[PDB]
Every structure is written in C-alpha cells, then in structure tokens.
Design a protein around this ligand. Structure first.
Ligand SMILES: NC(=O)C1=CN([C@@H]2O[C@H](COP(=O)(O)OP(=O)(O)OC[C@H]3O[C@@H](n4cnc5c(N)ncnc54)[C@H](OP(=O)(O)O)[C@@H]3O)[C@@H](O)[C@H]2O)C=CC1
Ligand SMILES: Nc1nc2sc3cccc(CNc4ccc(C(=O)N[C@@H](CCC(=O)O)C(=O)O)cc4)c3c2c(=O)[nH]1
Length: 186
C-alpha cells in the first residue's frame, strides 16, 4: 500500500462544514482538484482508497457516490454493512488501515486518502508515521458548525512546492483560495 494522506478545504476560521454541506458555495475547480488528487494513482493496476466518516459519506451527493475510480471505505460503529454504493465499512481508523494489508486489498490499493470529517482527520493527524496534508485555504471566514483540527506546525512542514499543485491564488465565485501541502514523519 502507498502513502497516507489527508485532503480538506478549510476557511480562515477553520471551518469545513455547515448543516451537512460545505460552508461556502460550490467551487467547481476546487472540487475538481479534490477529484484529481484523490483519484490519480502513481501505480499500474492499482487505485487509491478513500476513508471517510459516515456523515461525510452522506454529505456527498448520491449521484456522485461512490467516488468513482476510488475504493470507498466508510467508518461507522452503528452501521452493520457498507452503505448503498460504498465498498467497505470499518469500525476504527486502525481497522481500516489494517484492512488495506489483507489479501483482498494489499495489491489493489496505491494511496490512502482520509477525506474527513473532523474526528478522523484529528486521529490521522496524530497517527505516528509519514503523512501528508493537502489543504485548500479558503481565504475568507464562513459560518461553520464543523471544524478542521489544529495543524501542529512543529511536525507538519509546509512544502515549498509540490508537482501538480498550483502555487498561485485561485478564485471562484469571488472567493480566493490557495493550495498547500504539508508533510510530517514521526
Ligand atoms: N471542507 C471539506 O474538505 C470537508 C467537509 N466535510 C463536511 O464536514 C461535515 C461531516 O463531518 P463530520 O460532521 O465531522 O462527520 P464524519 O464524517 O466524521 O462522521 C461522523 C460519524 O462517522 C463515524 N466515525 C467517525 N470517525 C470514526 C472512527 N474513527 N471510527 C468509527 N466510526 C467513526 C461515526 O458514525 P457512527 O455513529 O455510526 O459510529 C460518526 O458519528 C459535513 O458538513 C461535510 O460537508 C467533510 C469532509 C471534508
Ligand atoms: N479539498 C477538498 N477536500 C475535500 S475532502 C471532501 C470529502 C467529502 C466531500 C467534499 C466536498 N467537496 C466535494 C464533494 C463532492 C465531490 C464530488 O462528487 N466530486 C467528484 C467530481 C467533481 C465533479 O463532479 O466535477 C469526484 O471526486 O469525482 C467533490 C468535491 C470534500 C472536499 C472538498 O470539497 N475539497
């Protein structure tokens, strides 16, 4: 199995969600960035795995679930089976990551992408080991009811470049944003 990664888009006040959707109106190229990052696999005959909490799964429009071209794994202790359209169900992040080492998935999975929400980001974000964060900084405050956990910059180094990530300011619908990649190894 290849690298472990989180990806998120976050406002200045560290918001990621409001009322089961995003705090901001749709940013179509930002959404395409998420698709591109999470789907593109650096390894022949493998695809990437996405790990998400149950509310994040249900926050994706049903037409667009599962996330195509990726293996979709949902985290829940209440569900008894994967939701309609999802591929796997685990009861803890440790369990999900162990599952990628089983015979079913060992040779199928390239990158693992944690796609939220707050509790799985926080646990992944303190998982000792080599981890990257792909963070879109939405450069405005937006009312939110879900937030991204604190990024400890002593351990997460902001990388000064990364191939395939644009470095300048982006703007859609009057909203400026920029792309960042962080890396820790501990
Ligand atoms: N801006 C962005 O990049 C993103 C925004 N979002 C937004 O965030 C919100 C959804 O996030 P959030 O509310 O944090 O909810 P989550 O997606 O984390 O869902 C929480 C549910 O997932 C299960 N769960 C979470 N972590 C684990 C775990 N480690 N092990 C087992 N089960 C787990 C639980 O289900 P159970 O009770 O069944 O056990 C829990 O009640 C929405 O507003 C969405 O739009 C989400 C992702 C990214
Ligand atoms: N940087 C960032 N991280 C995350 S992490 C995360 C986890 C859950 C939800 C979101 C919400 N944003 C979405 C929601 C759905 C889609 C979707 O259906 N996408 C299709 C293709 C897009 C299209 O149809 O062109 C797909 O990937 O094929 C794309 C983006 C995000 C999200 C985010 O918006 N941005």
């Amino acid at each position: 199995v290849g690298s472990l990664n989180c990806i998120v888009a976050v406002s200045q006040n560290m918001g990621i969600g409001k009322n089961g959707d995003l705090p901001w109106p749709p940013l179509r190229n930002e959404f395409r960035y998420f698709q591109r990052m999470t789907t593109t696999s650096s390894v022949e005959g493998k695809q990437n795995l996405v790990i998400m909490g149950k509310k994040t799964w249900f926050s994706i429009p049903e037409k667009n679930r599962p996330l195509k071209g990726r293996i979709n794994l949902v985290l829940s202790r209440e569900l008894k089976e994967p939701p309609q359209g999802a591929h796997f169900l685990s009861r803890s992040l440790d369990d999900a990551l162990k599952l990628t080492e089983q015979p079913e998935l060992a040779n199928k999975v390239d990158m693992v992408w944690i796609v939220g929400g707050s509790s799985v980001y926080k646990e992944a974000m303190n998982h000792p080991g080599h981890l990257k964060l792909f963070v879109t900084r939405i450069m405005q405050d937006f009312e939110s009811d879900t937030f991204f956990p604190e990024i400890d910059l002593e351990k997460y180094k902001l990388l000064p470049e990364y191939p395939g990530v644009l470095s300048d300011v982006q703007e859609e619908k009057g909203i400026k944003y920029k792309f960042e990649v962080y890396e820790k190894n501990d």
